[PDB]
Amino acid sequence: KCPAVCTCTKDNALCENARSIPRTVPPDVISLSFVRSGFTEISEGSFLFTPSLQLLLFTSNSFDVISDDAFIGLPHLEYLFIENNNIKSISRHTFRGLKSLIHLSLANNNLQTLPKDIFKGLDSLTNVDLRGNSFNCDCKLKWLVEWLGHTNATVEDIYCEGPPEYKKRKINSLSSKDFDCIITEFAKSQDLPYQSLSIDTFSYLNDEYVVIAQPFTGKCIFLEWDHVEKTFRNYDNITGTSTVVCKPIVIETQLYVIVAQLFGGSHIYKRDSFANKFIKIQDIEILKIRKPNDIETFKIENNWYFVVADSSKAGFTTIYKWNGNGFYSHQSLHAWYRDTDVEYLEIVRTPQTLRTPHLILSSSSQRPVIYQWNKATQLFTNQTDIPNMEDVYAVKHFSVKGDVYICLTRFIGDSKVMKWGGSSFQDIQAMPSRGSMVFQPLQINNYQYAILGSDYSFTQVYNWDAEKAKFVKFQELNVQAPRSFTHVSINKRNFLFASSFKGNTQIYKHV
Amino acid sequence: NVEEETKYIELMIVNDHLMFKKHRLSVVHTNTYAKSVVNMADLIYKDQLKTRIVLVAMETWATDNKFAISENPLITLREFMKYRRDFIKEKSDAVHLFSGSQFESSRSGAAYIGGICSLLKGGGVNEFGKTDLMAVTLAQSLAHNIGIISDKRKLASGECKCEDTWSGCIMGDTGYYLPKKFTQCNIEEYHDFLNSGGGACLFNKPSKLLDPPECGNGFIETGEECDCGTPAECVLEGAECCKKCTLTQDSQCSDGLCCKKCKFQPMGTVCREAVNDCDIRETCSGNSSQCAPNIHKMDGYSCDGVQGICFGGRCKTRDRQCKYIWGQKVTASDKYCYEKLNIEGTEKGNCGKDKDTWIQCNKRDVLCGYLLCTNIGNIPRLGELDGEITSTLGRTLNCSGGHVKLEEDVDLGYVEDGTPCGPQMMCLEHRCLPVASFNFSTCLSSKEGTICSGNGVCSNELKCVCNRHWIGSDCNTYFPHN
Ligand SMILES: *[C@@H]1O[C@H](CO)[C@@H](O)[C@H](O)[C@H]1NC(C)=O
Ligand SMILES: *[C@@H]1O[C@H](CO)[C@@H](O)[C@H](O)[C@H]1NC(C)=O
Ligand SMILES: *[C@@H]1O[C@H](CO)[C@@H](O)[C@H](O)[C@H]1NC(C)=O
Ligand SMILES: *[C@@H]1O[C@H](CO)[C@@H](O)[C@H](O)[C@H]1NC(C)=O
Ligand SMILES: *[C@@H]1O[C@H](CO)[C@@H](O)[C@H](O)[C@H]1NC(C)=O
Ligand SMILES: [Ca+2]
Ligand SMILES: [Ca+2]
Ligand SMILES: [Ca+2]
Ligand SMILES: [Ca+2]
């Protein structure tokens, strides 16, 4: 007798809202249809109790899996229409045993892929419908392009819905030639068994070094590259009770290091080539600089400078100038402000045509400030606030297509990306910051990346999209409380250093 | 005792106009944001100082500022306390200002030392910042009120140091990485302040908060009959007595100094002994689980013999003032040192400074002039030293003094107002005046020439605390009771 969820004639059964494939469909039916069904899976041998089927229809259903040999035991099946469904997974041997199949439809199921050899052994096929899906044109779809080229069956034109460089491409028009199967990733190099705040890189005597500030121990850890073992060793160390930043400056092949400390005051070290050591040659007064949080270096018309952001009130953010022997006070900025970060910028002010030096200051519960360099007075003036931005932690800039952009970081709320347009910064996009301390732009192999750190969740890596003029999700890293991201380039090898405030500092390989 | 008890800071928050603008002109946002700051400050205090910060009152200046906010925190503080004196009429142990602005000083706020329980000194001011940061700001502000000062003498000597290398300690300069702990030295200062007779208004336990009732909060709110604390610490006290904030079958109370195994402590039981000769002992009412509100002798009572006079439960002597500024090892100078130097009116001793010239003290107003100490050091425990330290020489007496500046106006190094300068005479603005000049209030008395009929002591609430077997508001009625 006809199952309750079905409506039956002598030859045909139409089932709706079935909770499982009924085992009690009359065994003499030759056409069977399932619509709006409850069951989520079609396991092997699901239709053995109706061995004389010539036609099967599935429409408006939701499936978790259609398994291997789902349609086995159906040697007379000539028509199989699977359309307008949600289907999570189809298996390689789903259609095995369907030697008599004349017309197969997989239309309008929003399929993103098909497993290799899915149509293997379907020797009677005259028609296959694949329209209305969402195929991703990658290496997994390569077999399909070949099959389309060799099959005698009639197949309509179908199109890639991804990846973006392939969207709306006619799949029938693809060749084995066209698969972009290689592609990059940030692979984990090694995990250094200690914590770190700020990481810096420099070039000294044609070798690449990495400086790591150890907050809790006191050390400024210098790393050196081993060209045979292909790892980083421990070049040398610098002791300072509470180091926050270790900024390297190279002036005419001589290496200088600025060491910002929260305790005991900040000091300036010089590398000695003869004695093969670091020498303490200058002391920054403890009363002018008290609570440093960031150091940035820059060069304006053959003059070397550096700026120290002071997060204390009594301590003013101060610019120092290289005068051949050491560094000395040049200009103080943002009095009584809790400056968190400094950023150096070279930006075009309308209607000029040349980039002029700029500084950006970020302070607690305050708007970011843009200072402009004045050549006449040899100091930064003309400050302007960046509107739309409250409580910004830090600012970092990058350049694409000649245009200049910046990345604004917040701890909570949303981080922002802005483009410079002559007179002011404009909104591009925004991203949710879950305990973020970093939003660092990086340019590797002429690829523009952006790594947004997070203390609460995973660190998100973004890539620049040329079509979108925006950052898109790329790869997802996992580091405990990231504090910085730095790019290290050594002989066509690109490394990514990720500082960790509670966990281990991590080195990544870019391949 | 007084340091093993749980203390409670009944705090009021005032939000200025700029703070209101910071939360987008929203009343509800300002309230919850301030409560967050208070709660986080509370979690800091609860852990180490054994003290709770409880929000008891709040108002927000939505229209405009009541006065001009200064970039100088000390200037701002004073104008706020003037506002507090004239316009704030709700009761609190301390009143603190939340400013949306940012100060042009080294500190993120300012607060009077030993200020709690006072009307003019009972408060502080705090600048805006992130929730976690302002909480620390409030903690170090309430710290000054509560008597905690980073002893610079022990800091320089290395006697007191913060063991936290990274986050540092609360009374230290604050940076991005916030402190979480007080030093042990801070704890002792806090203990010393209470033992000195300070923080009397801190022993009333608040019941109904400004939030929905919470069972397991350690506070008896609306609907609930009792509240032990946390299920972990309820085991220690209140476990048998209280079940799901409800009194058991055989229970009158849950926890408290006047509660013994779910029962009230009989009337007459000492629950808090006098910390000094300015304090009044407290006895259980027999009708309450908490110990009676900590009260003490009114302003005017003598202490340390006749050498001192009680003010706010604390003894004002020249000896203690010297210990307060220069250290415990320092003692006050002999009266002969004053009797010679102050009369001169030189830099080495005077009754104040008037336009580049010192005032020559009168012969009676000699004990109210330049403070003189012995065995002095070269670094004050608090404030900034302005100038150098005076050192002057049958016995030859070494007179030493010094100008210590907390405020531009307030100068430590002169005899504090209220300090005795003779029989029934005190110091007032560098002048020796009789007790009637201070206009002290008086309790009820039914016997002439006696305080409370000569059978009681006048409390700071202007009520008579009768001796044993005496009753009545005038303590004149005798009551015999074994
Ligand atoms: C497809 O056409 C080829 C011609 O090369 C033929 O050999 C093969 O048998 C045909 N197969 C099917 C399934 O149509
Ligand atoms: C430097 O490294 C050596 C060994 O690599 C270690 O023993 C020393 O303590 C380190 N010192 C600092 C300041 O990092
Ligand atoms: C910038 O400096 C120029 C100096 O020529 C002055 O005219 C202008 O008012 C300044 N603007 C600001 C915002 O300081
Ligand atoms: C508690 O005190 C009130 C007076 O305030 C008194 O009327 C009442 O009887 C007392 N309760 C007990 C149980 O003694
Ligand atoms: C006591 O005297 C002061 C001024 O000497 C005065 O301001 C105050 O009002 C007086 N107190 C009373 C209660 O009259
Ligand atoms: Ca920076
Ligand atoms: Ca109180
Ligand atoms: Ca409660
Ligand atoms: Ca008392």
Numbering used by the authors:
A (entry chain B): 41 to 551
B (entry chain A): 233 to 625, 630 to 718
Publication excerpt:
We coincidentally found that the R470A mutation of LGI1 enhances the expression level of the complex. The crystal structure of the LGI1R470A–ADAM22 ECD complex was determined at 7.13 Å resolution by molecular replacement using the crystal structures of the LGI1 EPTP–ADAM22 ECD complex and LGI1 LRR as the search models. The LGI1–ADAM22 complex structure forms a 2:2 heterotetramer in the asymmetric unit of the crystal. The length along the longest axis of the 2:2 LGI1–ADAM22 complex is about 190 Å, which is equivalent to the length of a synaptic cleft. Two copies of the 1:1 LGI1–ADAM22 complex are aligned in a head-to-head configuration with ~90° rotation along the longest axis. The LRR and EPTP domains of LGI1 are connected by a 2-residue linker (Ile222–Ile223) and adopt an extended conformation. LGI1 EPTP interacts with the metalloprotease-like domain of ADAM22 in the same manner as in the LGI1 EPTP–ADAM22 ECD complex, whereas the LRR domain of one LGI1 molecule interacts with the EPTP domain of the other LGI1 molecule, thereby bridging two distant ADAM22 molecules in the complex. The C-terminals of the two ADAM22 molecules are oriented in the opposite directions. The high-resolution structures of the LGI1 EPTP–ADAM22 ECD complex and LGI1 LRR allowed us to interpret the 7.13-Å-resolution map and obtain the information of the intermolecular interactions between LRR and EPTP and that between LRR and ADAM22 ECD in the 2:2 heterotetrameric LGI1–ADAM22 complex: Glu123 and Arg76 in the LRR domain of one LGI1 likely form hydrogen bonds with Arg474 and Glu516 in the EPTP domain of the other LGI1, respectively. His116 of LGI1 LRR likely interacts with Glu446 in the disintegrin domain of ADAM22. It should be noted that two human ADLTE mutations, E123K17 and aforementioned R474Q, occur in the interface of the LGI1–LGI1 interaction in the 2:2 LGI1–ADAM22 complex.
